[PDB]
mmCIF file of C-alpha atoms in Angstrom:
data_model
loop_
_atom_site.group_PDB
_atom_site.id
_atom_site.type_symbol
_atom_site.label_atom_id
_atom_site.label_comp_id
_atom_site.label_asym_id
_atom_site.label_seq_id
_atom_site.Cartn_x
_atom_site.Cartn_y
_atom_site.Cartn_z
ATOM 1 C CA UNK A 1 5.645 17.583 -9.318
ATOM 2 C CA UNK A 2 9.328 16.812 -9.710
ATOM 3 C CA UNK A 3 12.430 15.238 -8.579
ATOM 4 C CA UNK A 4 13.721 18.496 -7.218
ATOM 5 C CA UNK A 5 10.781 19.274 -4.619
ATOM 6 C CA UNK A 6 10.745 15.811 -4.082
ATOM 7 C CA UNK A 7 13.984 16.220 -2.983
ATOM 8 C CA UNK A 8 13.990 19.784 -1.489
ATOM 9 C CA UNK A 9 11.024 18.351 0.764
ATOM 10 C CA UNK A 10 12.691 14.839 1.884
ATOM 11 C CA UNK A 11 16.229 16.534 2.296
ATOM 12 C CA UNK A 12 15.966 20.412 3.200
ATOM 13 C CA UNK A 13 17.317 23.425 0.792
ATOM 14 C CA UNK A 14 19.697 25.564 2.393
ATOM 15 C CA UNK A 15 20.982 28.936 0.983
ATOM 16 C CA UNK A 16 23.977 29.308 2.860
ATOM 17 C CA UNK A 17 27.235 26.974 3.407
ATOM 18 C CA UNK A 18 27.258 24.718 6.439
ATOM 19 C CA UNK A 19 28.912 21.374 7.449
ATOM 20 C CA UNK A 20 27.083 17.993 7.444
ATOM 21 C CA UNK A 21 27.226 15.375 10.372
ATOM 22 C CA UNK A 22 31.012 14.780 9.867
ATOM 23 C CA UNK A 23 31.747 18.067 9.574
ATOM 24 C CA UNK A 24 31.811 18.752 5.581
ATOM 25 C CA UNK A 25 31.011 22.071 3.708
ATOM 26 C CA UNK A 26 27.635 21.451 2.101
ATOM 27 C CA UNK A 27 24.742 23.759 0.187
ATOM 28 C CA UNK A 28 21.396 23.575 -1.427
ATOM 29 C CA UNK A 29 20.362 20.226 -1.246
ATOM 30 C CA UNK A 30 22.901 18.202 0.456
ATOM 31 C CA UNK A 31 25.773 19.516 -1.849
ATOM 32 C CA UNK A 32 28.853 18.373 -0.751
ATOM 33 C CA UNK A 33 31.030 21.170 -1.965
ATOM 34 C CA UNK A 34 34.782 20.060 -0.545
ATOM 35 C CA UNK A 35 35.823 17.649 1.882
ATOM 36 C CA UNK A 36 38.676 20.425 3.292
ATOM 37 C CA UNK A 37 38.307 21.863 6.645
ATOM 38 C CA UNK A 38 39.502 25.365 5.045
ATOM 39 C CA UNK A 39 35.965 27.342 4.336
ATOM 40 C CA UNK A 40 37.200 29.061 2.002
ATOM 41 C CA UNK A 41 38.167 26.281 -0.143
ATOM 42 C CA UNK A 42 34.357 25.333 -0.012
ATOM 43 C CA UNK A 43 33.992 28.791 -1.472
ATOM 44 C CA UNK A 44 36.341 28.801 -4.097
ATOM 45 C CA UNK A 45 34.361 25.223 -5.050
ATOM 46 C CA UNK A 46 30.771 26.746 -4.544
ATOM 47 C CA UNK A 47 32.265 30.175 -7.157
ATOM 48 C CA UNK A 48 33.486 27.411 -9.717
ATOM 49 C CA UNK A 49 30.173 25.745 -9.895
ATOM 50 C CA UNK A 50 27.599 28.278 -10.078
ATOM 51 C CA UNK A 51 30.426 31.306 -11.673
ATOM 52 C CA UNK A 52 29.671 34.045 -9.331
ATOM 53 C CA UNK A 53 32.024 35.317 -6.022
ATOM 54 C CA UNK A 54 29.266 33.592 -3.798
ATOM 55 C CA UNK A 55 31.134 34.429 -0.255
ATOM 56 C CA UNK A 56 29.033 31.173 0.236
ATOM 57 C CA UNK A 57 25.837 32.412 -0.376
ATOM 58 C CA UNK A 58 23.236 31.296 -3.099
ATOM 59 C CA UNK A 59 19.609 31.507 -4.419
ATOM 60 C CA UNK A 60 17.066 28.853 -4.903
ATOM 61 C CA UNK A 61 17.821 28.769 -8.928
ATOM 62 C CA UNK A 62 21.491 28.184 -8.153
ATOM 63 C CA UNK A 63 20.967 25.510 -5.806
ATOM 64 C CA UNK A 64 18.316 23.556 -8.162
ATOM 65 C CA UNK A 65 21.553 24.003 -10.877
ATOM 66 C CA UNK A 66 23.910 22.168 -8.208
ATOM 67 C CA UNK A 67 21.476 19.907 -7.578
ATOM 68 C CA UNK A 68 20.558 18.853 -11.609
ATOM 69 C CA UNK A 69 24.250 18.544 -11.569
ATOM 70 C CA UNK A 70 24.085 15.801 -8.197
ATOM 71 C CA UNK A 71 21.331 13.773 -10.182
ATOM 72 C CA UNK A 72 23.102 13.414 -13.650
ATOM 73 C CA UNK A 73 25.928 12.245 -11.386
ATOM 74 C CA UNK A 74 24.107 9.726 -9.502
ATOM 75 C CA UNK A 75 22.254 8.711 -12.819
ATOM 76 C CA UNK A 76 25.633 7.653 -14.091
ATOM 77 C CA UNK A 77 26.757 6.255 -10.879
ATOM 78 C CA UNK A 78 23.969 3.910 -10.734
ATOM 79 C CA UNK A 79 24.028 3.055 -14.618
ATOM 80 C CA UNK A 80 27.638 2.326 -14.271
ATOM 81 C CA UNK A 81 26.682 -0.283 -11.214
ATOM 82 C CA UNK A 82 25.565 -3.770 -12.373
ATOM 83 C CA UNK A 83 23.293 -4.026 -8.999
ATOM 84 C CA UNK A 84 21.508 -0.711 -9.654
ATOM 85 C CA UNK A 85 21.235 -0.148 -13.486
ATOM 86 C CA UNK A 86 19.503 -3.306 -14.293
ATOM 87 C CA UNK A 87 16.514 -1.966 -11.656
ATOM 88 C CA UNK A 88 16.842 1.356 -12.809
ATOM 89 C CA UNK A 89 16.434 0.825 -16.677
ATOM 90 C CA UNK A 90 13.438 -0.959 -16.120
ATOM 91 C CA UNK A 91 11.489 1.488 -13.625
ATOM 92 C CA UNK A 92 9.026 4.755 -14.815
ATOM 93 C CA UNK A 93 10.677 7.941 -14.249
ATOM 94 C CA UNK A 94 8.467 8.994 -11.015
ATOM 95 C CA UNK A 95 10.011 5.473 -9.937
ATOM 96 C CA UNK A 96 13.548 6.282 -10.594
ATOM 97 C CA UNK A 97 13.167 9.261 -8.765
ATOM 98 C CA UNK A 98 12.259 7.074 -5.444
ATOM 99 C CA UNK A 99 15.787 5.163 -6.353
ATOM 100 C CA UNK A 100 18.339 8.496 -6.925
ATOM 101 C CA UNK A 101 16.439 9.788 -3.417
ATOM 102 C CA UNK A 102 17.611 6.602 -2.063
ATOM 103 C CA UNK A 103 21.089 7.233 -3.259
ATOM 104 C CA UNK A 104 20.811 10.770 -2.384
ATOM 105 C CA UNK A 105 20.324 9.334 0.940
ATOM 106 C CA UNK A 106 22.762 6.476 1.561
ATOM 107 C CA UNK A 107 24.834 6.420 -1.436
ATOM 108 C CA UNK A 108 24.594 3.502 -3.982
ATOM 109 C CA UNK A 109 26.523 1.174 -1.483
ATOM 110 C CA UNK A 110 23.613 1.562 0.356
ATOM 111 C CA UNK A 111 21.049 1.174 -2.503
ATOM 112 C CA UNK A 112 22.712 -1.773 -3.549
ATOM 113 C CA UNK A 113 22.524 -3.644 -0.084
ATOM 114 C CA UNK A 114 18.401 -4.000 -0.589
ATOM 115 C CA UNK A 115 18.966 -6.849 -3.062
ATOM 116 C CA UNK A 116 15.598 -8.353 -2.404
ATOM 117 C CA UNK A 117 13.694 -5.042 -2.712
ATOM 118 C CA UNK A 118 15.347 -4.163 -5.936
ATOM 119 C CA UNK A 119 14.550 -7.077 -7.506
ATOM 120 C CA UNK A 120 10.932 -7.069 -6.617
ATOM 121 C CA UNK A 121 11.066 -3.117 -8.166
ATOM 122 C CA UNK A 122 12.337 -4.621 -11.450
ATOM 123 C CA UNK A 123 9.478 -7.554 -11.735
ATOM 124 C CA UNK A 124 7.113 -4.633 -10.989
ATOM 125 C CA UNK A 125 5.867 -6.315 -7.758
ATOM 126 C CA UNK A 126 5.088 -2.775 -6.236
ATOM 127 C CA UNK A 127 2.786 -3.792 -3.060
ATOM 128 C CA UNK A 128 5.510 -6.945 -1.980
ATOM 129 C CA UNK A 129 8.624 -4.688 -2.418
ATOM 130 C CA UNK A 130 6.989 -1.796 -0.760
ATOM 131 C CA UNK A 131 5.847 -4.043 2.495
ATOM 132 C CA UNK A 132 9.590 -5.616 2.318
ATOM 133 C CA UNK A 133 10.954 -1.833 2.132
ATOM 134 C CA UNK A 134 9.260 -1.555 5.489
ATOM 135 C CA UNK A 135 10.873 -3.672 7.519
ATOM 136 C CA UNK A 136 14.214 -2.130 6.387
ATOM 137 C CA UNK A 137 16.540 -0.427 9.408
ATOM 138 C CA UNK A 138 16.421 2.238 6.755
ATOM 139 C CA UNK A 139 12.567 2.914 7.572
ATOM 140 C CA UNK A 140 13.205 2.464 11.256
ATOM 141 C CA UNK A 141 15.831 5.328 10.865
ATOM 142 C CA UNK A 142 14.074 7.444 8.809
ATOM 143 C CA UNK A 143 10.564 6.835 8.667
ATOM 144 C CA UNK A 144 8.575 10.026 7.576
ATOM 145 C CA UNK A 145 11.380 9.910 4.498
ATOM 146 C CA UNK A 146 11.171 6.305 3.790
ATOM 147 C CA UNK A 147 7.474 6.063 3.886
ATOM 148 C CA UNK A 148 6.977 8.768 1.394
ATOM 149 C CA UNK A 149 9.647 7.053 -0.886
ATOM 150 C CA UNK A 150 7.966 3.994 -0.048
ATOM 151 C CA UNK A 151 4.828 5.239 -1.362
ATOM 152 C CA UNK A 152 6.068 6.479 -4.737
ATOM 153 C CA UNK A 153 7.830 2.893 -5.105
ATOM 154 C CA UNK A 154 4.120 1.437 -4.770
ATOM 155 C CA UNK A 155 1.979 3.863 -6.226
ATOM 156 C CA UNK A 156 4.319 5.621 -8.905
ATOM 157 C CA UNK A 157 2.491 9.120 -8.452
ATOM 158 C CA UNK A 158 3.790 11.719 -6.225
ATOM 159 C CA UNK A 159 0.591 11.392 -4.355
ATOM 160 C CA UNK A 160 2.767 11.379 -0.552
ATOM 161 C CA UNK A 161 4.046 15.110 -1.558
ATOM 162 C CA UNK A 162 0.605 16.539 -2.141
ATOM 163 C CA UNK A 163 0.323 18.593 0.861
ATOM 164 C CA UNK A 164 4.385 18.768 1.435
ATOM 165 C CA UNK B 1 -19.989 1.384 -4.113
ATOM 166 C CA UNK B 2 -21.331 -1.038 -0.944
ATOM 167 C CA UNK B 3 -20.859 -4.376 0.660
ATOM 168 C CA UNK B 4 -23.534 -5.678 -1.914
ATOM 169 C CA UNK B 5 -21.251 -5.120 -5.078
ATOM 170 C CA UNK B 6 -18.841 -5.685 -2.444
ATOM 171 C CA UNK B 7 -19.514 -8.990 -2.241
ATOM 172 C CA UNK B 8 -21.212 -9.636 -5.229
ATOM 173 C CA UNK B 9 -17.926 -9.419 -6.979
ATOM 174 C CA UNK B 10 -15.960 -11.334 -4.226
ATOM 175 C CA UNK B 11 -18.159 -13.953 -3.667
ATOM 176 C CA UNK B 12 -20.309 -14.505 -6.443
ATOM 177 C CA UNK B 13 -24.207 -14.260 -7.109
ATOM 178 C CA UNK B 14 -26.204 -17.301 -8.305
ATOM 179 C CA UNK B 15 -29.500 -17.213 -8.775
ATOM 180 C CA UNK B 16 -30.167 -20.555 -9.220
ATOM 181 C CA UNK B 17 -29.713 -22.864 -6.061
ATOM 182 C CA UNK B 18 -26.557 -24.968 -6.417
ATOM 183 C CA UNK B 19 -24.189 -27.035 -4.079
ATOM 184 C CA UNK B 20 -21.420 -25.519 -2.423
ATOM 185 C CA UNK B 21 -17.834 -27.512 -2.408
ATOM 186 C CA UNK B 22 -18.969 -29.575 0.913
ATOM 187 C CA UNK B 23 -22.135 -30.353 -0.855
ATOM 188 C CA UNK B 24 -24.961 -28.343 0.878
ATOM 189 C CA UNK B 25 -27.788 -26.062 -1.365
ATOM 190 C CA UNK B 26 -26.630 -22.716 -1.803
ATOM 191 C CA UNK B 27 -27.886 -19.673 -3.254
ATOM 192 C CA UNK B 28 -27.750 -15.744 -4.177
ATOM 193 C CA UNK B 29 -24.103 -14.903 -2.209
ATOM 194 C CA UNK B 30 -23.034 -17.906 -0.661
ATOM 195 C CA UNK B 31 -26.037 -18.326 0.846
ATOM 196 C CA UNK B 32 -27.028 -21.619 2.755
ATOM 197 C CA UNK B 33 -30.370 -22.873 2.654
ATOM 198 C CA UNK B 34 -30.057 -25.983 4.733
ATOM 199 C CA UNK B 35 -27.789 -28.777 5.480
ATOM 200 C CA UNK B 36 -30.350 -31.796 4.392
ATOM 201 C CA UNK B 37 -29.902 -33.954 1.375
ATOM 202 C CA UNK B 38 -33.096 -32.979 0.256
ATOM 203 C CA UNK B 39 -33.931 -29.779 -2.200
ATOM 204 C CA UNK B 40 -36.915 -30.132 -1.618
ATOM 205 C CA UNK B 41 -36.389 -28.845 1.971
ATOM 206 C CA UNK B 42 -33.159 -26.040 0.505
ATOM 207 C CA UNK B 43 -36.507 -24.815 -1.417
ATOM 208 C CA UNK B 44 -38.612 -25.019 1.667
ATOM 209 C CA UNK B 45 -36.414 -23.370 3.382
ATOM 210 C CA UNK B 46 -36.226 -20.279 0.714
ATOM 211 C CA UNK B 47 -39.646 -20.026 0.152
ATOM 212 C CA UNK B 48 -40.039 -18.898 3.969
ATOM 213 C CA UNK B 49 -36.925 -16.799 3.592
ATOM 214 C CA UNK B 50 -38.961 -14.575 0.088
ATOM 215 C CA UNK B 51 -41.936 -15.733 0.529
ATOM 216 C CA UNK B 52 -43.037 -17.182 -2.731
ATOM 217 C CA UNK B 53 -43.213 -20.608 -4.191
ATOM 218 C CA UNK B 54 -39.666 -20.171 -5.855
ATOM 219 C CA UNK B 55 -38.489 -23.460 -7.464
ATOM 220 C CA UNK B 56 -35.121 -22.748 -6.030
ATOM 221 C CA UNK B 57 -35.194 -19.543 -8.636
ATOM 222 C CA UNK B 58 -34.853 -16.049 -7.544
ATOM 223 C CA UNK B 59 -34.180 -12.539 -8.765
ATOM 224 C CA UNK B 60 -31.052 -10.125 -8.036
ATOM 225 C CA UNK B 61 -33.709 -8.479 -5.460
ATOM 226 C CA UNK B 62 -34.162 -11.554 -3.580
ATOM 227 C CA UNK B 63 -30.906 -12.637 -2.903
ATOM 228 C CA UNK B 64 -29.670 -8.736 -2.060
ATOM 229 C CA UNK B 65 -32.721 -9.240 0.267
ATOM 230 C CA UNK B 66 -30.516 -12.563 1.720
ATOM 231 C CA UNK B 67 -27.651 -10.726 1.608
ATOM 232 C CA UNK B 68 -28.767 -8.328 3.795
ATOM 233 C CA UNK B 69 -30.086 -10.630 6.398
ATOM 234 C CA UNK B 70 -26.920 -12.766 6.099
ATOM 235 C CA UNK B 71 -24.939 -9.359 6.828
ATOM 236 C CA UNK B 72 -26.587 -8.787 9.568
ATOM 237 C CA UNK B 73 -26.072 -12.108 11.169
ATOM 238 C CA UNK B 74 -22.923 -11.705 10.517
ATOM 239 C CA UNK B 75 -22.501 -8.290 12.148
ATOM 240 C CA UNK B 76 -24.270 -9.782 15.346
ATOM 241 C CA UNK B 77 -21.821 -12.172 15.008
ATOM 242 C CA UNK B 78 -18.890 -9.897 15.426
ATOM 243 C CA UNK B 79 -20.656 -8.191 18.146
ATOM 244 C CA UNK B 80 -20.986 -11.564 19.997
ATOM 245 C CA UNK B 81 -17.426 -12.285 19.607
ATOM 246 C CA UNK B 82 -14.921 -10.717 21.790
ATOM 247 C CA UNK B 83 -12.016 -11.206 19.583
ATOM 248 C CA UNK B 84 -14.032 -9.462 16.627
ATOM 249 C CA UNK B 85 -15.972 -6.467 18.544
ATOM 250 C CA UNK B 86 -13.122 -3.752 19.292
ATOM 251 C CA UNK B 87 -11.901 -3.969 15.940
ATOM 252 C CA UNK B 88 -14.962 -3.612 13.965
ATOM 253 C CA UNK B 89 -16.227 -1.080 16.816
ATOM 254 C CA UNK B 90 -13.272 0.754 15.579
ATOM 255 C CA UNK B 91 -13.203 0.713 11.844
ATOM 256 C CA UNK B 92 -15.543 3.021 9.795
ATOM 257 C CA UNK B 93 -18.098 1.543 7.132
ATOM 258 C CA UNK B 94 -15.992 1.027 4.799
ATOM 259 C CA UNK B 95 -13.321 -1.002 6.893
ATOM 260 C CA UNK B 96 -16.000 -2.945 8.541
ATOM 261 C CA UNK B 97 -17.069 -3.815 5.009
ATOM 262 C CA UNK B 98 -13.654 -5.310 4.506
ATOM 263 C CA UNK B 99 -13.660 -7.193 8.061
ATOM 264 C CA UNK B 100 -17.602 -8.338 6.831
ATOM 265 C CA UNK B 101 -15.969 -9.901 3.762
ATOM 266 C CA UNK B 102 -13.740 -11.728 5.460
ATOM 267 C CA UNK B 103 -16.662 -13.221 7.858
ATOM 268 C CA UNK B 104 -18.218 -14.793 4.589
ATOM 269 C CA UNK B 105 -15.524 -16.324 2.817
ATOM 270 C CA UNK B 106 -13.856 -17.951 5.906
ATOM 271 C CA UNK B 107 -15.778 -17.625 9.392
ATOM 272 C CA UNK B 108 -15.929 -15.841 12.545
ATOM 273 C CA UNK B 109 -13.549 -18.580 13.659
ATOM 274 C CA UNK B 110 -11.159 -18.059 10.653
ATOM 275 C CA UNK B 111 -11.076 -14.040 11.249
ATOM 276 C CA UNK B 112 -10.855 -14.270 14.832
ATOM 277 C CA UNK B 113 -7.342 -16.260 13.938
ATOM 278 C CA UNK B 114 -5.478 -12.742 12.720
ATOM 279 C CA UNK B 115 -4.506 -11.762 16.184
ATOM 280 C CA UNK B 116 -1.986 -8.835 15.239
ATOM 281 C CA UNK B 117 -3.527 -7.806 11.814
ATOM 282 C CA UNK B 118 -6.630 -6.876 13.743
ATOM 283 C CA UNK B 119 -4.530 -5.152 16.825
ATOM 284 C CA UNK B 120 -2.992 -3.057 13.989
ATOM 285 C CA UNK B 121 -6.528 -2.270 12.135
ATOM 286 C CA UNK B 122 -7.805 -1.479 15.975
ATOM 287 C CA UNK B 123 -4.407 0.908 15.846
ATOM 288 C CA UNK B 124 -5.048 2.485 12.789
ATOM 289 C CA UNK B 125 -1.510 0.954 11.283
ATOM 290 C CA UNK B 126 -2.965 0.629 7.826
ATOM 291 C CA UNK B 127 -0.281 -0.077 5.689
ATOM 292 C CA UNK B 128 1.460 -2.467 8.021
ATOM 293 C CA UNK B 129 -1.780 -4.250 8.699
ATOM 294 C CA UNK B 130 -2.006 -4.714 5.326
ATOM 295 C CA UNK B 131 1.639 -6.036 4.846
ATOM 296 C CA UNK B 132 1.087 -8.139 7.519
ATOM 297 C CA UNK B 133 -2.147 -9.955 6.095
ATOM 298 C CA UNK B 134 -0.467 -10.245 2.447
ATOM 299 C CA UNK B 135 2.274 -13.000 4.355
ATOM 300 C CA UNK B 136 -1.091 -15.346 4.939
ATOM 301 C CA UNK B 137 -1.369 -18.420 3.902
ATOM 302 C CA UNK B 138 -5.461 -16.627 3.129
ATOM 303 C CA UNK B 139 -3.679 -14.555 0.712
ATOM 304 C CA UNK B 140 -1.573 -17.456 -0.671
ATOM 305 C CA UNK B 141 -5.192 -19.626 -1.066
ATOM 306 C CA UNK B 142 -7.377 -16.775 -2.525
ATOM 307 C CA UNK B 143 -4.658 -13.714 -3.680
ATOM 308 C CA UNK B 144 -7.197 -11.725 -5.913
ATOM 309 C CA UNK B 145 -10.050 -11.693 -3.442
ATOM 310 C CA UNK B 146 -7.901 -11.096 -0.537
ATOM 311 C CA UNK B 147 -5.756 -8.696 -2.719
ATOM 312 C CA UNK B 148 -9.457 -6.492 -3.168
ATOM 313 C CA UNK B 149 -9.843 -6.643 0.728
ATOM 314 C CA UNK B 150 -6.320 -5.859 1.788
ATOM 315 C CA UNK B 151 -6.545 -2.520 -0.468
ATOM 316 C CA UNK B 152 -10.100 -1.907 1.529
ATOM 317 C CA UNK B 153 -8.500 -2.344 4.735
ATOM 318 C CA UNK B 154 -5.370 0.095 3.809
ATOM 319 C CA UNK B 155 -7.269 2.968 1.873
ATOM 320 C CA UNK B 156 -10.397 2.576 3.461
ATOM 321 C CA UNK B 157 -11.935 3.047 -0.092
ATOM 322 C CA UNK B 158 -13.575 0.877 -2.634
ATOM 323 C CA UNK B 159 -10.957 1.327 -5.135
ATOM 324 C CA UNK B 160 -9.998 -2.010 -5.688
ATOM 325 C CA UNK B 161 -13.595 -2.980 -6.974
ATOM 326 C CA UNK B 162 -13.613 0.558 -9.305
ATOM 327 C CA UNK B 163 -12.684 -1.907 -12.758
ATOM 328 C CA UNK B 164 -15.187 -4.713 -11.401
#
């Protein structure tokens, strides 16, 4: 297992350009390709990034490129925030994967609200920080997500994508 | 694995009898002989229970032999109890083990007290059950035993006791 079918699983894969929930030009794994109403400005975007004339239409290879692109960038968007980084540095890499599909999620304003949580992460008190994860809003929202993530927080296997 | 080893490792075997912390003979797994002052009855009272002139000495056989009718008072106790039956009519073997453990080290009394961790074991919540039993003041007195059962309770395995 990886980050990317962790991701393709808890977020979807889609081939072909279509707007998010406020209406933006996305791709592959919740790419965010321009924030422009013009569609073909999301094109032009989508042909810079992968170097093909796409007419907004890509294969699975191209979107796992965009997407190793979206996790260097959230790598250095966490390592350049002093709530994130110190958490980050000090978790496994199956661990770190739970965080950037946290920030995938909600961004790393909203990674950075779960003070408690992230602190427990970094003194490697899996079962408490997992439990406290739980009572989040963010597991009332999304539960099937954040239990999975949850799980890979407290086990650090990908043991809740085996049959996924 | 079983309730034996179980409890063996939880609890503790002695083969020798001894005093427990309110001062009555003990022996094998927390087993109480009598509440008198005198060892001389406590070994009265075990040489009925194995039938041989013991001294107040037995063998691992002996006090699994104990154990077993000490189990089974206990699971008539559950059955007696109507704060105790549905959930350990509910649970499978393993589970019950769990709820079983928790009958020796603190009382029918004592388990019938966890009102909503048992309505979420009855409702197969697992994981919050288990949350919900780490915020005890049980877990705060006796973490690594209650640590063992909590896993029991959430996997419904004997993993905890794998390293024991």
């Amino acid at each position: 297992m990886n980050i990317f079918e962790m991701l393709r699983i808890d977020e979807g894969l889609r081939l072909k350009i279509y707007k998010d929930t406020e209406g933006y030009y996305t791709i592959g794994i919740g790419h965010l390709l321009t924030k422009s109403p013009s569609l073909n400005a999301a094109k032009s975007e989508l042909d810079k990034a992968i170097g093909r004339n796409t007419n907004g239409v890509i294969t699975k290879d191209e979107a796992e490129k965009l997407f190793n692109q979206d996790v260097d960038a959230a790598v250095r968007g966490i390592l350049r925030n002093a709530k994130l980084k110190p958490v980050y540095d000090s978790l496994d890499a199956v661990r770190r994967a739970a965080l950037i599909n946290m920030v995938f999620q909600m961004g790393e304003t909203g990674v950075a609200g779960f003070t408690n949580s992230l602190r427990m992460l970094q003194q490697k008190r899996w079962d408490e920080a997992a439990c406290n994860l739980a009572k989040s809003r963010w597991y009332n929202q999304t539960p099937n997500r954040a239990k999975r993530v949850i799980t890979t927080f407290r086990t650090g296997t990908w043991d809740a994508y085996k049959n996924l």
